[model samples]
Target chain A: VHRLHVGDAREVLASFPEASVHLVVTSPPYWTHIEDYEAFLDELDRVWREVFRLLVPGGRLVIVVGDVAVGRHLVFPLHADIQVRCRKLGFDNLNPIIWHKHTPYEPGAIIKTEIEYILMQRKPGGYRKPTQEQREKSRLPKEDFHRFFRQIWDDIPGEAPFPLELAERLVRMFSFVGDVVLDPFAGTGTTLIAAARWGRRALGVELVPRYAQLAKERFAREVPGFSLEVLDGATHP
Target chain B: VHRLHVGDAREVLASFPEASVHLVVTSPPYWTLKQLGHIEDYEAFLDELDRVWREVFRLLVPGGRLVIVVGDVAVARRHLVFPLHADIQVRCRKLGFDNLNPIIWHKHPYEPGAIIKTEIEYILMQRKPGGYRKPTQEQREKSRLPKEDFHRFFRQIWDDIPAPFPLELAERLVRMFSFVGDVVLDPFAGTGTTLIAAARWGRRALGVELVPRYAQLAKERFAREVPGFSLEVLDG
Candidate 1:
């Protein structure tokens, strides 16, 4: 069953059964305060730690993040920082995919801004299940390139009204139908809509009420069989 | 006159007068070493650019702008670093086009290397005969930000712009640099990065690409990504 929850994700996650989810893909807010970016990386770190605890063995989490410009001098490259922390927390690094936005934001005289990346991680195998290749390719290769290093992608652009279809394409590429897909920061229900449209059971949590409602309304029209619950900070029955 | 050559730029550019073009915006091969088509060697890449600039000076209306975007490759031999851009700028200055400011196209971080690697792309802006006009009083006034913020933010060392996606970056650039109908040009136009930006932002764009695959990719991407943009093909 598809579900949509509204509450602080940290609070919502506490109620979930351990190792219940299969795949998680979402773009978390950048920690930096500039440009109305509110979610701190530390909080994001906590969310990831919780996500790791929730994912079934061999399940994956895909995080798409934009870099933060701190003090106009340094770019806090989040993908690397988060990757290092996730590895330390026991998740095996899978791949870094670039979700190249086909267009730039605010294109003009100043330098153009284009591109974000998906950082994917997976829990190790043993208790639950594993992909076929993971069983055979567990040993690290002597050559770095030969090893299954993460894919590094270049800039992808995002044009106006940004197509909601891209999210669907990405989710389908990563997970299968009927697999539970989760988006913690379910902005306007793009992920949920995409998942439901593709026949995958999606669970999404949005912190903002207006957007949660907006997402609910949009899905109400698009997905009939899917179930969405706007939580009053309570556990599912 | 604006042109769109579908073939390799090296051969097409060779047909132009030695010193008959103004303004060159090209991103040449970076130590790929292997000759793909018309471009044969590192020397050929450099020479092709040099020849293009020579023509650029001749065709320029004494103060036309020329911009070249270039970056160094991490390969067996590190032939040129950031300074190579300056060297090229100096060569252009010697060729009678006065050197203008060199703006940095600061991309976001790459996947982590053994050491943190940052690739800095260069936008070498120049003007023929003499450098282009300084900002007008009104223009300068329009661009002014708070002194402290401006001092800290407006440095030539640009490290703030986030690398989102290529299309997003192109859109951002097109919005920032050109008006709605301005004729934007991208010579290398890899994967239609510049052309896509121009098309999406309501500006007219003309790009010259050498590699068939890159040109094909750009064409396909544009067809899918842009709706009302115009595209033309020219023989090299």
Candidate 2:
């Protein structure tokens, strides 16, 4: 079943059973507007601890992020800090994919921030065995396999949201047919859409009600096979 | 004049006067490829690198840059990615550097999903805090980069290079960062790649290498390539 929780992921994910998720794909807020960077990281740490708890053994979490530039001179390596923090929370860091997008322009002293990171992190437990039937159903073709499994993914738009193609590719590559895929900070339900299309059960948490409704509608229209359940966390006990 | 010293990069670079060097472009050893005995722990390796970066901070002139070409380390057995490039930028910024956008060198000819095949390297641009350089009229004329070369050099992604740091890459950096007669340095000069590039473009070249064998190799390479090159060796 496709489930959408309209609430804070830190609390919503905590209420779920441990090791419940197979994979998570999300683009967290860069916190460029946030003044205290350490506080921002601490806030992320709170959510990640839950992500770690709810991830299945040998499950993966892919983060889409770009480094932030505060003013003209100061820069914070956002991707690196997250990787380090996640690794500390018992995740094995994998080689990150370079999401090379069109160079966006800005009047500045520094060079262009043209690329974002697709950070791949795996939870360490024994290997995942999805049975013979699951393997055959989830098997990938050679053409897509070569394109999907690379260090650099070029030609994505810099000024776009979690583009449907990118979300689809990640969802297909990381999860099995019936696996439960999650998006902690699901903005507009791009991850949910991709997960629904690929036959995996989608679970997402959005802080804002409007954004949650937007995603909830798209899921309802795009794939009518699976019934959608949008839970209002406002009425929680 | 060209000079080569064989010792710890941190120690050898410290002898130079503060703010004496114009540019430092070098690739430090990856924790995997070249052991050097003290690189067993990733933190220790980074701490050792910090010592060298500290010296670079002192050695650079007001507008000088310390350009580092580094790649992320993948400990294959553990399936761990030590993001050396990102970590270095954060650390160097704390060392009073104006960290600029890195040139991502997409090395041609390379993974499956088990680990995303690492086909890229990071050329970190770490500039010391200061106003722009003040070049003499003659120096400006001598160091002017061509229009064709100018456009290609500034881009954040470089797809032309085959592998990691090439000699041509070193030449581009030396010309871009320094004046004609200024001093250029490579704190971890492996085989004088940066030094040769500097000397070729009329900058005085200085290198600090840990291994004596590599120092000798660099000297030989210099003798063959750079005419009128005299690389004086300094020890201890």
Candidate 3:
């Protein structure tokens, strides 16, 4: 089952059940390019604070962010700031993975930022002992574990909808079958689509109605027969 | 004739006449590399780099370009990213150098073990105070880059440059930025790649190496690879 909502992320997150989501993987907007740095951080604080609350014990959160050049003279380290914020909120900081983007078509910069950081954090406490069925459902093949365990991920350029392969990798590695995955800043629903394909349930929130519609259309065409509920202007089920 | 100086770059650069060199191309030691004796302190290392670049600024003619190929380093214990290229860009801008387009050198991909494999380095291209004028017809004819190279080099991303700082990349930069017989300087010349590239492309080249063994190796490389090349070795 999948649920797509059109509302503010913070407001939508507020209504989610406590400790319901098993994993979260999304890229927030770059704070440097946005106006008012502190304000941006403040908004992010609210969203993440709720995210921390909603994630189950041992649940993982992966945020992809790139450093930005501010005013041609300084680099604003957005990942580091987010790390600090997450730590203050009591999330265990895990080793970050580097995502190298191959974009030969894009123009270069004085410092070409071809890399983005995947900051991983975990909620306090460990997972409950899994039953036989749960273990079988969540079993990751040895070959995959060996390949994706590496800290560096080299892939093709991503789009506004995010890369489907990246979403698959994260879903396969982090969540079990039937586990609920959430994307608070979902754009075009790549996460939900991946979750549904991987046998997991998903919930996504997008502020823009057009993207919410686009996500639904993509899901309907790609994974027909899967139940998808679109909640318009509703914070909770 | 090429001049090879075996000494510190700062002292060697002081001896050169001001505004004498047409282009400066070099890659300095990275921070926190124990093999290269790099300082662990990022700020101190950048301060030292700023001193050398200030000298480079003084030696270049108006509108001459300075191309620095560098990679960022990670602070392992803290899991912090050190943006070396961005730091240098800011410093050069403060030193009154006009920032130009940068080239992204994407290395061949490999399996990264525990951490992300850094397959890309930054080639920061900056120019002196005055803007560069268009090359004359004669100059362009003498130093024109290949047509295929013109298309790739104009783009910001480059996957063509081979690892270990191949001579082809340096040659391209020299051909695109300098005229025939123009003097090119490489302050941190290792194995004389920059000098060899400049000479091979019909330009006068000067290089300074701090280590004795590498300086000797560069001389040997010049003799074996570039036979009959006029090279003057200076003990600084």
Please name the candidate that would achieve the greatest lDDT relative to the true structure: 2
lDDT of each: 0.56, 0.80, 0.74
Predicted candidate 2 versus true structure: per-residue lDDT over B1-236, tens digit per residue: 68989998887887789988988999977467232242347767788898999999998997688899988887665456777886787778668787777778888511113456688888888888766567788888888777777667767788887723789989888877788998999988878889899999899999998889988988998888798776777775
The TM-score obtained by model 3 is 0.64
Which stretches of candidate 3 lie above 4 Å from their native place?
Answer: A1-166, A169-184, A200-205, A220-237, B5-22, B33-47, B50-66, B71-106, B109-130, B149-163, B233-236
Query: Which candidate has the highest DockQ of all?
Result: 2
Candidate 3 lDDT, tens digit per residue, B98-185? 6664666776411111334456677777778664435456665777655676666665567766624888888877876788778899
Best by TM-score: 2
Candidate with the larger TM-score of 2 and 3: 2
**Candidates 1 and 2: which is better by DockQ?**
2
> In order of the candidates, what TM-score does chain B achieve?
0.65, 0.91, 0.89
Which has the better TM-score: candidate 1, or candidate 2? 2
Error of model 3, residue B159, in angstroms: 5.0
What local lDDT score does residue A82 receive in model 3, on the 0 to 100 scale? 76
Candidate 3: lDDT over CA atoms?
Answer: 0.74
True contacts kept of 1: 0.07
> Which residue pairs come into collision in candidate 2?
B111-B117
Interface C-alpha RMSD after superposing true interface residues, each candidate, one decimal: 15.0, 5.6, 8.6
Report model 2's chain A TM-score.
0.91
Is model 1 an incorrect, acceptable, medium or high docking prediction?
incorrect
